[PDB]
Amino acid sequence: MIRAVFFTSWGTLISYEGVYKVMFKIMEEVLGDYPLNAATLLDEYEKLAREAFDNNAGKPYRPLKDILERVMRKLAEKYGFKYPENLWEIQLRMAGRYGELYPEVVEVLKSLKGKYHVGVILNKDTELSTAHLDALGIKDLFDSITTSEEAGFSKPHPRIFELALKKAGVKGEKAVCVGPNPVKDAGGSKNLGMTSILLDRKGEKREFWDKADFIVSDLREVIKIVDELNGQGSLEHH
Ligand code: NA
Ligand code: NA
Ligand code: NA
Ligand code: NA
Ligand code: NA
């Protein structure tokens, strides 16, 4: 029986275009009138942030605030603008203002919440990652929020998934995990015995479909999958 459904954040709940918007608005605020195109700065920020996250994958948690400070110091030295004071407050304010959910998210979370433990797993940190969900209005729809900062390790290390399962009170076989990353999400959750669901919203990841138990293009399909897994043996499923 599936008793719990876990979701990641980026590309699952919060759209990539929404994440891009937040980061673009941060770059614009940092630059002020400095004569650098903010989209150009954004591309380099994304590259450096991605490189740091990927290097930390599966390792003990590293404070996000320090990562973003190191990235921005590199960018300020590269491009010649003054390093911004209160960078963290800029991050929090822009996360409070910008971003968007995929259009089916609220409906799906509400449909599941009545029948399953609905959890979110966050890899960047606790504070900023939770603040973004709160600003988008979905923080309280979750029965649990579990982060790499709380577990002490980032995906795909097992501890983050172990902690999420403890919050739900079940072993991995009673849970599904939905996310876009075949290694960090599908592989990571399957290591704890969960049923892995790869989210491929654009149908562009076929070469990684073998890394998951199920593939979906939107979150409405998750409800169907869990209902199917739980309808085994009744007269309706038959
Ligand atoms: Na629930
Ligand atoms: Na409940
Ligand atoms: Na935190
Ligand atoms: Na933090
Ligand atoms: Na794992």
Tab-separated table of C-alpha atoms and ligand atoms in Angstrom, residues 3 109-110 112-119 141-144, ligand 1:
chain	number	residue	atom	x	y	z
A	3	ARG	CA	0.879	5.613	2.260
A	109	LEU	CA	-1.425	18.413	-3.595
A	110	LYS	CA	-4.931	19.039	-2.219
A	112	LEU	CA	-3.542	13.729	-2.249
A	113	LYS	CA	-3.361	15.384	1.131
A	114	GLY	CA	-6.637	13.841	2.315
A	115	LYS	CA	-5.537	10.250	1.603
A	116	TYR	CA	-1.697	10.112	1.807
A	117	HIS	CA	1.141	11.720	3.763
A	118	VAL	CA	2.255	14.452	1.300
A	119	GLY	CA	5.872	15.477	1.701
A	141	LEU	CA	-0.216	21.836	2.152
A	142	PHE	CA	2.642	19.519	3.127
A	143	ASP	CA	2.443	17.005	5.933
A	144	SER	CA	6.254	17.107	6.017
B	1	NA	NA	-2.082	13.882	4.402
